[PDB]
Design a protein around this ligand. Sequence first.
Ligand SMILES: N[C@](CC1c2ccccc2Oc2ccccc21)(C(=O)O)[C@H]1C[C@@H]1C(=O)O
Ligand SMILES: N[C@](CC1c2ccccc2Oc2ccccc21)(C(=O)O)[C@H]1C[C@@H]1C(=O)O
Ligand SMILES: *[C@@H]1O[C@H](CO)[C@@H](O)[C@H](O)[C@H]1NC(C)=O
Ligand SMILES: *[C@@H]1O[C@H](CO)[C@@H](O)[C@H](O)[C@H]1NC(C)=O
Lengths: 723, 723
Amino acid sequence: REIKIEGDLVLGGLFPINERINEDRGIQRLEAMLFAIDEINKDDYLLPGVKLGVHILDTCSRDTYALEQSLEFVRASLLIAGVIGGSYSSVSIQVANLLRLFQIPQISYASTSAKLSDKSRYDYFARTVPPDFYQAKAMAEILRFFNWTYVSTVASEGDYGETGIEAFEQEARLRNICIATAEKVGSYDSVIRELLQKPNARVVVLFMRSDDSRELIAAASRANASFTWVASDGWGAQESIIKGSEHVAYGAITLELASQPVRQFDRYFQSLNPYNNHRNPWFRDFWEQKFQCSLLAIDSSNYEQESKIMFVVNAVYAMAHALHKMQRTLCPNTTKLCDAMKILDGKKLYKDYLLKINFTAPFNPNKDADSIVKFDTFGDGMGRYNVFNFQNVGGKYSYLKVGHWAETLSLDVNSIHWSRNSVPTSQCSDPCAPNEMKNMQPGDVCCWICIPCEPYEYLADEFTCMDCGSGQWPTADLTGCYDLPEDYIRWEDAWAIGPVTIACLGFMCTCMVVTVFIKHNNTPLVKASGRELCYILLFGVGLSYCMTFFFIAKPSPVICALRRLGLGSSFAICYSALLTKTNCIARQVFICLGLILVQIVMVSVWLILEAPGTRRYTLAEKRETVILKCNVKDSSMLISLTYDVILVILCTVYAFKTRKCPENFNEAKFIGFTMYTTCIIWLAFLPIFYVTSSDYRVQTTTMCISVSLSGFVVLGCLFAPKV
Amino acid sequence: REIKIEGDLVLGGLFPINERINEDRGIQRLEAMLFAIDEINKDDYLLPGVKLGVHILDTCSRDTYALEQSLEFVRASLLIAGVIGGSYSSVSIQVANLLRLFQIPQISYASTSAKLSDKSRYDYFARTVPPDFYQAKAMAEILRFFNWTYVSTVASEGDYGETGIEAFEQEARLRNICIATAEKVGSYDSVIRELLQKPNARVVVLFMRSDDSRELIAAASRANASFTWVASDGWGAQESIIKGSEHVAYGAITLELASQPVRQFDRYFQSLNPYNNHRNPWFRDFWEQKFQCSLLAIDSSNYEQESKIMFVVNAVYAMAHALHKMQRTLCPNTTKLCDAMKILDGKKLYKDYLLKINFTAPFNPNKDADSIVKFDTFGDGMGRYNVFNFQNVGGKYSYLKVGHWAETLSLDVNSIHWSRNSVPTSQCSDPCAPNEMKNMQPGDVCCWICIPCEPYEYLADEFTCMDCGSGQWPTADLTGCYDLPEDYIRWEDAWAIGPVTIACLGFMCTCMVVTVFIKHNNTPLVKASGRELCYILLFGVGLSYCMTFFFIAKPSPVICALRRLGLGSSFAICYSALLTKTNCIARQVFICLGLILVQIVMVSVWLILEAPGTRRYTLAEKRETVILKCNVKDSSMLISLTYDVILVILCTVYAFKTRKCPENFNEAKFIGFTMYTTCIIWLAFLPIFYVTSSDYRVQTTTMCISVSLSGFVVLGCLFAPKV
Ligand SMILES: N[C@](CC1c2ccccc2Oc2ccccc21)(C(=O)O)[C@H]1C[C@@H]1C(=O)O
Ligand SMILES: N[C@](CC1c2ccccc2Oc2ccccc21)(C(=O)O)[C@H]1C[C@@H]1C(=O)O
Ligand SMILES: *[C@@H]1O[C@H](CO)[C@@H](O)[C@H](O)[C@H]1NC(C)=O
Ligand SMILES: *[C@@H]1O[C@H](CO)[C@@H](O)[C@H](O)[C@H]1NC(C)=O
């Protein structure tokens, strides 16, 4: 039962006027689509001369009942510069596969599918309401705002759920949002039983149908295990979806589309009676089913005005301003039909100056804020959502409007209510302390594992850990780690108590020997020996007492200069002062031959005096040791004294021959047993010197052991009863 | 000017009957579409009772003139169970966006696009001719048959070229076919000038339009540089595309679709006059423009029958057998309309038992070979092409039919004519000899580079080359390479000439010494020396003459057993036989002390007699050397004789004391100068023994040099004037 009201050029429109007569989503809209043309053809601010006409049908929500109507539009190619509206999604996808085939554009006031932006097929389809592939980029950019980046989704089955959710994951992996489970309701209440077995995912992304999101929540009062319900448009502000589960569905957020409703439309529509409406074929039919009467009037107590009445009067203007540009720019100085308005080619209509129009909606303020009825490059207006909340003040439910957003989130941050006031992160990995600073993603993203790394190591990265180098221990963190000192044995340490007492024998070395050096040269056996030779033959014993304190005092390069040079003067006193005096005694002007022989091995040390390391080093044992106090090898100083014992190897040669023939009082016993006793400790401390850790007593105490036995057992016996 | 001939159920058809009246691709086909129904409604082998009707239009090749006709089909929803034919591509894509919207299937007799298989859009479109995305999988599987795997393409601009070529490359990379250039003609003849600058690509894949492949070939007679023209369907068997370039377009291959034409159609169509054809609105109109007469008859001299007349009568049957299945299987025991033929739902018509039908074409033999009118799962019959050739016998052109193919190539291999009889590979890289066996693809595929690899290396792969190991040289190929021998100096080599003469002095060593061994013990100075000691003191000189031939004969493990043990008995004869006889002479029952001293250093060699290597080794210099004839170090045998010269280090000690006091006739001169002379060559050959390559004379000749100087300069002088 169409109505075709004539005009200079006529618009066409489809509406549900069938199920019964629908009044919520139905005939309320067709009353509004008539109401705009009563203003546009009257208000001469827009199109002055060309009077608009209307010719509208009854879409009855059945697809192949809409298409049997839709050819009666195009039997005039009552020429029609476009058709307004396909309400549902499934009725608009059928008059968008017949209205590309006549090059005539379409504007649908409310149909919000997501296959209706694939403009490779539809070159003639521009809706005003936003596509629902934006709520997969709405909530996916508030979770990264709240850092709840580990979620658990649930869809519906059919066309709504499988489109948004498959667009939700691919619009989440950019924003580092990391799903856990994925259900699909077609089970009854066991869907929560498959949901509790991931219990660090406590943010439920709910992208659901209307009534198939009632059977979940009403059966989520059985298990009584609440959550944080973030929900897409399936909730809306419906107060029946939260029917009695206020103790269960507490603390939720939801989205809906904003529409500041037209005030004077209530001045239009409530002023409409079925005795003064002859310009409609359905006001008389609706009046029966409005009140179930067999025949009152419309009050404000039964005219709760629909939330998309603004979207028809917004989207019927976006042709009437893309035609007032036509009647001026394509035909100046011609208000009426200029004979170029005869064949109105739609291809240069839609793609040229309807695609990117810009103007303001009627009956609303803030003309630069939100009423800019823009388009994108696809035929889909910008998203203007609300973010409602179930933040109950305590009345019972109290749906709360905590703000809006268009392109970036603009919340009013005092609504996050979860248990009492909780912002649950719902995060899996829980990044740990720097004590476990190997926070490495094992195989997958977003859920890493912490690991305490090596105690000689610092964290090389957020996942990596590396040692800070040989020597130094780590820091208190992964910063610059430390340094590494050496063994400072300058104090006692039960190591400076021994040779400090052994130095007294070296201090008493030059004491008793100086008595026969000058004042007692007139002894009967002072002239019988090398009275000038003994002062050189006994001066080196104090050197052995001093080279221990020259070397083993503290690590220094001058000390290592004294350490390598300290031992090189021990053995010529031990051998050349000994052996040259015995050979002339074995058979006295030839006693001068022992002078230059001391410089034989000693001058060769002067060539190696500058070759090896002198300053310092640091030797590394198992992960904590730095002591190599001078940069020399252990076998380097041992080979430096290889000729030392080799020089006193012939020191026992003259002991065997003169073992029984003393040329003096006790020179065969005190001196003959001396070289046997001197080679004993000389051979004793040699293999032990390779193996030590403190190394002091094997160096210091063994050196003075030769020094004490030298002057006492040999030189002391000649003067002990002399007194 | 439609004709609507009634029936029990009526078929619908579109045809070009406009440009003028088209007779080649036009009204000849509509005469044939009428001719089939005159048989099907008459021959009771197929559908007995339901008389077929026809209702056909005039498509006039203009898209939005076809769609103004096409609603007059669907104004009855004269119900029509499908529409036959959209001839062009651009008329079929417009009645396939209006005939999905009524759930009615379509069969197009000749339209061969490649967007008309995207069955996600078109659920109601099944053509019979093959899609032209198959000739991108036809020629792309004969080039791999001929190994011409490096090509040079050329397209046309618009819809034909850019569809097949973009399908040609993606159907070539599987078969390892490797393009070089890619033109796009919209230049005039300079397109060849951009083509000669890749002159190892001499196979021109020509995927071209009809007339825009005339301006190339007629302008390829300018440059006179021929090729191998492989061409897709743009040639066909058109004899005008090769108008006068037989010397230029010689040697080509081309494709066309096979159709064995219906013989009795000529018995039908040539028996048609415009006085006995009242069942058509266009036989009277065609009769004017057939002969330009203002009013003869159709002869066989002007009725050259069209090549797709079989494709309309093939593809009008494939409904009439998908409806004879309907009137039996959906309504048994009911020949006529069974009241389930009232609402004939097309969704259960097309997708159920028209998609996979199988039967034989009328008026053709071989009912199991090629007339199986199958479908695939897309609505596109199987490809049955011809492979024509321009193999001129010499008449002038003589288009030649060298066979066919359906799913695999079935050529008759005697047509490859390029220059005289040439099969040009047109290949880029030209894989080289195993002398350049590093045939590695540098950065890209199909064009590798050959490289001679290392002469100590063999080809590890077709691209890789690796050395065969230390020692052995490569083989004649990349097989198992070789072995590596050692230096065999068993012959002379100017190395076995020297010590073979030096062995004679070792042979004359025991000659003169044996005279005073037994027969001349009664000499006055035989008893004055060690007459039993000299036989041990001179026996080892022959050992030194023999150890050279024991060691330096040939590499053997028993020889190395004699090489390490050969030198160990040289020095005790050189020192212990010498030094013990001198010490008792330096001041005679104590002459037995020199017996056990020979076993001092010698028994220590018995402990090392089994420790180091004994068998063999091979030392590797710069890429060609294997000789380390026994597995011992150079310093190993030199340290094995370190105590050797150390034992004769004290051999010069007694020479200084006894230099002037002879206890015999010349024992101070002949023996005193001997140990000075013995240490000379002993110190001489030592540093030279570290540095040699043949190593014989430093080993053999230096050993006998000590052996000759021992007995002659010392032992020979005592008996030289004795005679
Ligand atoms: N535009 C709606 C949107 C509809 C919908 C709305 C809310 C929740 C789920 C849901 O499911 C889908 C799925 C695909 C497309 C559209 C929807 C329509 O029915 O087409 C609806 C406002 C229109 C009206 O009620 O008049
Ligand atoms: N089927 C054809 C094929 C046509 C074509 C034929 C040969 C060379 C190039 C070429 O260009 C395209 C491009 C896209 C689709 C179809 C074609 C048609 O016109 O549609 C033609 C046999 C039909 C007739 O002449 O009646
Ligand atoms: C993480 O989310 C919290 C939520 O309050 C926010 O305050 C904070 O800025 C976010 N941090 C980062 C690094 O994104
Ligand atoms: C390469 O092509 C030639 C062409 O004659 C053919 O005979 C041969 O079998 C082909 N070889 C391979 C390995 O494909």
